[PDB]
Design an enzyme around this catalytic site. Sequence first.
Site, PDB file in Angstrom:
ATOM      1  N   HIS A  78      24.388 -65.569 -86.468  1.00  0.00           N
ATOM      2  CA  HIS A  78      24.265 -66.917 -85.957  1.00  0.00           C
ATOM      3  C   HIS A  78      22.888 -67.140 -85.372  1.00  0.00           C
ATOM      4  O   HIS A  78      22.324 -66.273 -84.696  1.00  0.00           O
ATOM      5  CB  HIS A  78      25.337 -67.196 -84.907  1.00  0.00           C
ATOM      6  N   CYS A 127      21.597 -70.100 -89.594  1.00  0.00           N
ATOM      7  CA  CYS A 127      21.560 -71.545 -89.497  1.00  0.00           C
ATOM      8  C   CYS A 127      20.351 -72.001 -88.703  1.00  0.00           C
ATOM      9  O   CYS A 127      19.841 -71.264 -87.856  1.00  0.00           O
ATOM     10  CB  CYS A 127      22.836 -72.081 -88.840  1.00  0.00           C
TER      11      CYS A 127
END
Lengths: 379, 4
Positions: A78, A127
């Site tokens: 992440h 991301c």
Amino acid sequence: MLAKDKVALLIGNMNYREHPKLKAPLVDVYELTNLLRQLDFKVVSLLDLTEYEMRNAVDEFLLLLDKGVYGLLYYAGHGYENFGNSFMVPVDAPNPYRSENCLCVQNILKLMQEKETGLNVFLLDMCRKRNDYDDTIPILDALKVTANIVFGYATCQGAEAFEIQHSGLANGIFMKFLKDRLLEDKKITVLLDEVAEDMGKCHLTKGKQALEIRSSLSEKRALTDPIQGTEYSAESLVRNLQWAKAHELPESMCLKFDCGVQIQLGFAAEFSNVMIIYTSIVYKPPEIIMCDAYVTDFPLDLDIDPKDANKGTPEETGSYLVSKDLPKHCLYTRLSSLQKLKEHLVFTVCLSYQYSGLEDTVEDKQEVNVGKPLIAKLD
Amino acid sequence: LRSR
């Protein structure tokens, strides 16, 4: 073109405690680690790190770096982006979280530049959306014009990077395409460009994810450049030796029990912080009819589940990556989070046996100390 | 498809 040294740090974060969990960073990191090793990179690969651990790993990476050295950071996990700054999200981040819980990639670049690297490569497989809880407006200091910087972002700013929800092994989108190109003898910028083209042909990711390359590299530097290996300072060689030690697991030891049986203790590395232990019943004096050997009493730091230890297959331990690369017919135990080790790894090999004629089971057990395992040596 |  030649590089004084080539050095990579690879981090995969999947098991977040307060955010959705990921599956493919383990394959991505494992496979990239192997390709990089084929290119003679000195590589450290780590799974599921906390903020503290991630910072420490970066500090170790930085220690390797020296003038002319090619440094590469790969991160699967992440991440977020605020104002063009990239942040890596550790597995111990709260929900919500702020920049101080994360690691800012640019700062790592600054520190690398301070080492006078010949090449700085960042492959950020994460991301790049905004984290609106993080309200800070950082005054990041302006980077020096190195001309050595290449960023390969798995996705575009404001967008998302993906992995495939397939049971069993499957790479993330980025690695899916990167791995087929990575060994090419081409300037890293061109290679990445080919990678961007390959991803564009993905129907599943069309309009959602596309590789973004950001480069200021003004020389023909490739990942396949040969290491010069002539000018190492003595301190570097020791650092290189230490790195090699971290790289290498303790060789297997044959345990001799007072009752005369021998057990084979074997070790395998999945990542620099993940080791597999296997035991087998190699030898029996006849007098003893039945043998049982199993491992236990691991340090608490490792948080090992006895339900998940001493298994029929490596697959049963959550080790899916290494198999049939391991001797068959052995109990298997997965020691992950090796970086959490305060004290030399010490554990207990237990043995249960019955003598022929005698009908009562005997219980004997001995403490094995391989001490520091892998990455743990580094400090 | 999984988001990172």
